[PDB]
């Protein structure tokens, strides 16, 4: 019923082979819409969704100058880290940030996100009360007391309750017909063969959006729970997604096993079987 | 849109 907006940062020191690289990507739901990369050759926020292309040039200046600013800010932050952790200069490290907001279905705030991470480890986190922080290690505590006294808390909250949800509602309406229109997965079940006194069925989910989906699937049943075999929800490439459950069952059983196929695109949710 | 503080730093 709801929606989300998430910007992601990736700062990556790399010494000898550069000054550090800084990348920013912006999603709405599972739709990538804005990209920034300080490599550039002449850098600026670039439009990757069609509904964002239709914006003022003054929108793009704001957004570039933000990430151009953040280029330097993080090159600093990567080095302030080295001091906190006493780390060698030759080492290559990574800072990762994610911030954003959830709406949803009426059109308010639900919760806020603002989360930083160092070398793939939780560093600092903005709590769900949007006024206090979580310090992971003794190094983050520096960087907490910095923001505590600088009253950084409120300027997020003001933004996350304001411009975050404001802009999101704008993005949604502007590209409603791709973003607010869930697509059902085209489902089928294939036979594989096997053993022969033992088979593998395979419940296919294809060509759907968003990535959220559940495939897991029966006999009487529950079932399975456990066999399984589930596979990582992979991207098709056309802004649609894919997935299967197996499973492995005895041969000639066999129409016992029923599949099971929850998506927000559907009403039902469906129930499939081997056909043939 | 994005939000830049700016003085938020490690």
């Amino acid at each position: 019923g709801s929606h989300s907006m998430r910007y992601f940062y990736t700062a990556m020191s790399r010494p000898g082979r550069g000054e550090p690289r800084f990348i920013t990507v912006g999603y709405v739901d599972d739709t990538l819409f804005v990209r920034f990369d300080s490599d550039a050759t002449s850098p600026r926020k670039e439009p990757r969704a069609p509904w964002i292309e239709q914006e003022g040039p003054e929108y793009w200046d704001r957004e570039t100058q933000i990430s151009k600013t953040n280029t330097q800010t993080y090159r600093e932050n990567l080095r302030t880290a080295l001091r906190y952790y006493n780390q060698s200069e030759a080492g290559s490290h990574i800072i990762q940030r994610m911030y954003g907001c959830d709406v949803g279905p009426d059109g308010r705030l639900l919760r806020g996100y603002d989360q930083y991470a160092y070398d793939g480890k939780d560093y600092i986190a903005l709590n769900e009360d949007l006024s206090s922080w979580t310090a992971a290690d003794t190094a983050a505590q520096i960087t907490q007391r910095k923001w505590e006294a600088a009253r950084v808390a409120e300027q997020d909250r003001a933004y996350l309750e304001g411009l975050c949800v404001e802009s999101l509602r704008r993005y949604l309406e502007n590209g409603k017909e791709t973003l607010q229109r869930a697509d059902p997965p085209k489902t089928h079940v294939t036979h594989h063969p096997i053993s022969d006194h033992e088979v593998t069925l395979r419940c296919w989910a294809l060509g759907f959006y968003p990535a959220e989906i559940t495939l897991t699937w029966q006999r009487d049943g529950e079932d399975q729970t456990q066999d399984t075999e589930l596979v990582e929800t992979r991207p098709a490439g056309d802004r649609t997604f894919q997935k299967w459950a197996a499973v492995v069952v005895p041969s000639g059983e066999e129409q016992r096993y029923t599949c099971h196929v929850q998506h927000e695109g559907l009403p039902k949710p469906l129930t499939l079987r081997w056909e043939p | 849109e994005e939000n830049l503080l700016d003085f938020v730093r490690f």
Epitope: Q65, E166 | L4
Partner: T-cell receptor, first 115, second 108 residues
Framework: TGVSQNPRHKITKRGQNVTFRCDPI?????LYWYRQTLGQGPEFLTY????????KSRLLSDRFSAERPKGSFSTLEIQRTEQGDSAMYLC?????????????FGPGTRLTVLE | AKTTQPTSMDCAEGRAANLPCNHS???????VYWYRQIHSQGPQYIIH???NNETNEMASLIITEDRKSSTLILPHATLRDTAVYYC??????????FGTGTKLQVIP
């Protein structure tokens, strides 16, 4: 009094060159340039972070060129001086935290271009 | 624009003194900032904040808290305080746009 500038004043004929300078407090991250005609507030010119020129307004003619190579001092150069360039050229800086937006200004180079 | 101030303005040493500003859009992630330029030099900072309340050595600052029309107090006004005052909105990262602004005269 942190920020210092060179020189305090300058005077020149028309189609002439002239370059100013701003030495901010070391360990100041950001450095700003402003111009101020007597009567108005300071108008924004350019803004540097470390050694990079992040923003610059349409007030910057091509004739103007700010530069900050080592990310310490900054040189502001005017190519073909006009009578309209005549103004106070201020230069402020900010500490490298800070927190808040506390800009520390200098004495200002005083340009007066004459016929 | 964003930043209507009285072009000038008197006061008496020393109560008041009571130095308004109208910022009648400002969305809520934008700070309200006040600077002062004492004639011969060349601005300093005085106070922000945020959308709040708030109150330091130079300066109090009362926001509407509906965000609407802030007021610098300068609490016991003196001759030294006579200067040009600028009321500017900062949204983070952007450039500052000093207005015109308010010239306060304090007379004994």
């Amino acid at each position: 009094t942190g920020v210092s500038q060179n020189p305090r004043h300058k005077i020149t004929k028309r189609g002439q060159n002239v370059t100013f300078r701003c030495d901010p407090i070391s360990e100041h991250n950001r450095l700003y340039w402003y111009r101020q005609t007597l009567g108005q507030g300071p108008e924004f010119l350019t803004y540097f972070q470390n050694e990079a020129q992040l923003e610059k307004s349409r007030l910057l003619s091509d004739r103007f060129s700010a530069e900050r190579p080592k990310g310490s001092f900054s040189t502001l150069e005017i190519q073909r001086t006009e009578q309209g360039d005549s103004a106070m050229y201020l230069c402020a800086s900010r500490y490298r935290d800070d927190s808040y937006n506390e800009q520390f200004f200098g004495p200002g180079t005083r340009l007066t271009v004459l016929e | 624009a964003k930043t209507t101030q009285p072009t000038s303005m008197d006061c008496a040493e020393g109560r008041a003194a009571n130095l308004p500003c109208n910022h009648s859009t400002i969305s809520g992630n934008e700070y309200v900032y006040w600077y002062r330029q004492i004639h011969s030099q060349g601005p300093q900072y005085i106070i922000h904040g945020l959308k709040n309340n708030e109150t330091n050595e130079m300066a109090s600052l009362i926001i509407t808290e509906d965000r609407k029309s802030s007021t610098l107090i300068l609490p016991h006004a003196t001759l030294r305080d006579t200067a040009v005052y600028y009321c500017i909105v900062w949204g983070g990262y952007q450039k500052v746009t000093f207005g015109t602004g308010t010239k306060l005269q304090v007379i004994p």
